[PDB]
């Protein structure tokens, strides 16, 4: 009747902040490539700023008992309270641990939390403990429970640091209640069907032209427009879009018709949006709002709407299928339908018209994991190198 | 019990004191100077409207911090478990090391003591122990540093000796006058040294081998320890502890370094009193261990050979001991102990050694006198 958190599940660790008497939900985040430290990503401002859950999702590999872990170190399981767990960062493939080196956040005793390549040692392992009197050691862990992770290495709880002006995550002797939200489970997923948080290409027309931004012009200002192109762009990196749902919990569930989502350009990091003048334009994460960056997939151009459909907690039912299914993008608020400008590789512009054209359906093609990782690395490298260049110029 | 206590103490960090709470904390050392300042300040130390009614708050703070340090050091795991590699023991020691930095311990050890002083009237003025910094506070820091961090590096050992241990030794030696010997401070400092510092330097004897660079520090340590041993108010256990410490240090020490100590030995051991027995053992052990240095023309390959001034020292040592034993009334134990020393010195001296017609010009009898040795 009630789901239990088991191994091989993808989740996000959440914490509650009460800065200036404001209840804020935050997630444990880490950009594994490059900066090894862990930071906090806000999810309370999802209506105003998109959370980056791709670097917040973690995978639960193993849930061993304490003595079994001790024996192993000397040499689809369900989690139980008092078991040590290994959390793998989904994007990086690395494991959460205590770095044993502190940035001295006004606490000599506290230790930093980061990612480690090797599973060897007791630093990567964390022991989960109940927060409420209802749960006891040995009990199954409910999906909606508050948990307190304890590092085997330093015996320090995973802590939320209010002391510094910027909220930090560290291993401290004070305990913090962490909430585990189920993103997706790999076993329940259906192969070949669209799921949340998946990198894909939007293939349109007869030549299978893919929606893309202009090629590298050395200007992010010029790389902010959207158009249809065909050829090698379909195998290039600037034609990859990440579909991000507005819901935090079960964000990896099967995408259903009429479900709002945000389309993020992986290489540039900007979210697809509609301007006031009825023109598509990529926008920054700070300015990416629901009002402008919300889009839905619809089976047909029929005027009658799907209406309201209740979100279900779980994998859901697979409706949109890669390749076979034909989809039409409609803005959630304005109701406009994505269409080609029909002006004459092809370099045809993409606008949104309230009727559109009869040939406006596009297919979906899944992107390989290596290609998506490479595009994300390109993003994370170009951002840092642009910052370095601007600093050098200043 | 120690593993449970450490876990509970880190679960509730309030028990560590405001200095070690971790946020806005000045550290153990700065807490010690803050307590010292409170101790000299009359307002905070006293109630400010004879000991059961009056708490000295600064001394109470020092005692609390010393007790916490002592408890944590005693909670530190035994070294045999760490050598065997018990992960729990390693984790406990790492937690304690993170809790207490080594620099704070070194600073607190380097904190100086107030010396009782004689006045015009002839009465020693003595600062009351219930208010101020006391050697028992030092003892806890020493115990923590030994049990948790450990002394395994020659550089760290010599730095510690330079900063914190030698000043206390010299103060104890300077407090060896007849009037100041019976003072509370002298007794407390002697007890602290003989219980904590000297056994530490005795167990860290092998680290004293390669100390050619720091010759002056080792010479000063040896002379100060010897004068402290010559002191009178010492107890039997303290005197034995100093004997063992000096014998352990001198044995591992290189032959060339104790040249300055032999100069004071040759002037005191001919007296053949009760105080000369430890010099007898020291001379016997040294001249038995390092006879190659003196007898062989090449000597030890690494240490080398004598400068002929050490040879003159050994010659007059041998002759003084022999003549003093000849004129001395036969005491069986003293005459049984002196003979090994005499034989070792006789073996060490080359049988073809020239007695130096050019004696050392201006010998230091006047600077180094019979009473007060200076």
From Swiss-Prot, chain B:
Residue numbers carrying Phosphoserine: 370
Induction: By TGFB1.
Annotated localization: Sarcoplasmic reticulum membrane
Function: Cytosolic calcium-activated calcium channel that mediates the release of Ca(2+) from the sarcoplasmic reticulum into the cytosol and thereby plays a key role in triggering cardiac muscle contraction. Aberrant channel activation can lead to cardiac arrhythmia. In cardiac myocytes, calcium release is triggered by increased Ca(2+) cytosolic levels due to activation of the L-type calcium channel CACNA1C. The calcium channel activity is modulated by formation of heterotetramers with RYR3. Required for cellular calcium ion homeostasis. Required for embryonic heart development.
Species: Homo sapiens
Protein name: Ryanodine receptor 2
Family stated for the protein in its record: Belongs to the ryanodine receptor (TC 1.A.3.1) family. RYR2 subfamily.
Domain notes: The calcium release channel activity resides in the C-terminal region while the remaining part of the protein resides in the cytoplasm.
Assembly information from the UniProt record: Homotetramer. Can also form heterotetramers with RYR1 and RYR3. Interacts with FKBP1A and FKBP1B; these interactions may stabilize the channel in its closed state and prevent Ca(2+) leaks. Interacts with CALM and S100A1; these interactions regulate channel activity. Identified in a complex composed of RYR2, FKBP1B, PKA catalytic subunit, PRKAR2A, AKAP6, and the protein phosphatases PP2A and PP1. Interacts directly with FKBP1B, PKA, PP1 and PP2A. Interacts with SELENON. In cardiac muscles, identified in a complex, composed of FSD2, CMYA5 and RYR2.
UniProt PTM: Channel activity is modulated by phosphorylation. Phosphorylation is increased in failing heart, leading to calcium leaks and increased cytoplasmic Ca(2+) levels.
Protein origin, superkingdom: Eukaryota
Disease: Ventricular tachycardia, catecholaminergic polymorphic, 1, with or without atrial dysfunction and/or dilated cardiomyopathy: An arrhythmogenic disorder characterized by stress-induced, bidirectional ventricular tachycardia that may degenerate into cardiac arrest and cause sudden death. Patients present with recurrent syncope, seizures, or sudden death after physical activity or emotional stress. CPVT1 inheritance is autosomal dominant. Ventricular arrhythmias due to cardiac ryanodine receptor calcium release deficiency syndrome: An autosomal dominant arrhythmogenic disorder characterized by syncope, cardiac arrest and/or sudden unexpected death, often in association with physical exertion or acute emotional stress. Patients who survive manifest polymorphic ventricular tachycardia and ventricular fibrillation. Unlike typical catecholaminergic ventricular tachycardia, arrhythmias are not reproducible on exercise stress testing or adrenaline challenge.
Tissue-wise expression: Detected in heart muscle (at protein level). Heart muscle, brain (cerebellum and hippocampus) and placenta.
